[PDB]
């Protein structure tokens, strides 16, 4: 996509959270809200940035945030990435404020799997799958964002043992993160139940440089996040399956889609 946004029609509304900001884009001096990501940076962060832009340019799917174009970023001697803006924001902000039923959360889970299967079918890994990077376009439509860490296959509290211990990252490693993301959904991203809160409670906060190693030891011993309240046993077993220590015993996102379809159906009625 070679779409170019002219800086002259861009007015900043707010920062969204690399840095992503919300702009109005209005050439008739009433128009479209857009999210714009901008790259301070130096040590080949620039090449990673070119990677992100090129990855997003090629991805087109209902459950992946839509690429809209680029604009000259004279101030960082780069491009800025222009994306669709989603007003409800990320599930991290939305879920604490609302009380979503199980069937709806399962639908979100299914849609995340669809976007991720698509991504994997493109030979890309995401490496940052967490509730905070899942955006809610409408009450029944989820989109995966934040491709900042995404890579062509040649967040430590969301990472599988092979990532933490060996610095490897498989398709199966994104499936582990999906498991943790699904746990977030079922706890409505309550901070007191969050993966950092729960794992720091076991590890403690006085382990010098060894936090990650301690986390790894607990995972390899088979320690896992608890069953959220009113998560069905079968959904908890699905999560535990996304968390197999051995990467090859995890389901793929392709495996997960028909299962999640079926369970959503069951809880919907
Ligand atoms: N298209 C977008 O990026 C985007 C689109 N609509 C949005 N509405 C509110 C935030 C937001 C977006 N924000 C980003 C998203 C969520 C949060 C903050 C931004 C960086 C983050 O990593 C973490 C991914």
From Swiss-Prot:
Domain Protein kinase: 10-267
Active site: 128
Tissue: Observed in all cell lines analyzed. Expressed in a variety of lymphoid and non-lymphoid cell lines.
Post-translational modification: Phosphorylated.
Binding residues annotated for ATP, in chain numbering: 37
Biological role stated in the UniProt entry: Tyrosine kinase of the non-receptor type involved in numerous cytokines and interferons signaling, which regulates cell growth, development, cell migration, innate and adaptive immunity. Plays both structural and catalytic roles in numerous interleukins and interferons (IFN-alpha/beta) signaling. Associates with heterodimeric cytokine receptor complexes and activates STAT family members including STAT1, STAT3, STAT4 or STAT6.
Oligomer status and interactors: Interacts (via FERM domain) with JAKMIP1. Interacts with PIK3R1; this interaction is important for cell migration. Interacts with MPL/TPOR. (Microbial infection) Interacts with Epstein-Barr virus protein LMP1; this interaction inhibits TYK2-mediated interferon signaling.
Family recorded in the similarity comment: Belongs to the protein kinase superfamily. Tyr protein kinase family. JAK subfamily.
Pathological condition linked to this protein in its record: Immunodeficiency 35: A primary immunodeficiency characterized by recurrent skin abscesses, pneumonia, and highly elevated serum IgE.
Name the record gives this protein: Non-receptor tyrosine-protein kinase TYK2
Source organism of the structure: Homo sapiens
The gene coding this protein: TYK2
Full-protein interval shown: 888 to 1178 of 1187
């Amino acid at each position: 996509d070679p779409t170019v946004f002219h800086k002259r029609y861009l007015k900043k509304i707010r920062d969204l959270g690399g840095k992503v900001s919300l702009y109005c884009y209005d050439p008739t001096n009433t128009g479209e809200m857009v999210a714009v990501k901008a790259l301070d940076a130096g040590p080949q962060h620039r090449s990673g940035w070119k990677q992100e832009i090129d990855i997003l340019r090629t991805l087109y799917h209902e459950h992946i945030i839509k690429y809209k174009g680029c604009c000259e970023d004279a101030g960082a001697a780069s491009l800025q990435l222009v994306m669709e803006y989603v007003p409800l924001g990320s599930l991290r902000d939305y879920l604490p404020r609302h009380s979503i039923g199980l069937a709806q959360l399962l639908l979100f889970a299914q849609q995340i799997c669809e976007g991720m299967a698509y991504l994997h079918a493109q030979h890309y890994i995401h490496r940052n799958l967490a509730a905070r990077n899942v955006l809610l376009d409408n009450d029944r439509l989820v989109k995966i964002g934040d491709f900042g860490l995404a890579k062509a296959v040649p967040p430590v509290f969301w990472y599988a043992p092979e990532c933490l211990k060996e610095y490897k990252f498989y398709y199966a490693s994104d499936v582990w993160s999906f498991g943790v993301t699904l746990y977030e959904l079922l706890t409505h991203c309550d901070s007191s139940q969050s993966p950092p809160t729960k794992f720091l409670e076991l590890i403690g906060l006085a382990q010098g440089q060894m936090t990650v190693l301690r986390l790894t030891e607990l995972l390899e011993r088979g320690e896992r996040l608890p069953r959220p309240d009113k998560c069905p046993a079968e959904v908890y077993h699905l999560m535990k399956n996304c968390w197999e220590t051995e990467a090859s015993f995890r389901p793929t996102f392709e495996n997960l889609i028909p299962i999640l379809k079926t369970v959503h159906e069951k809880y919907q009625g």
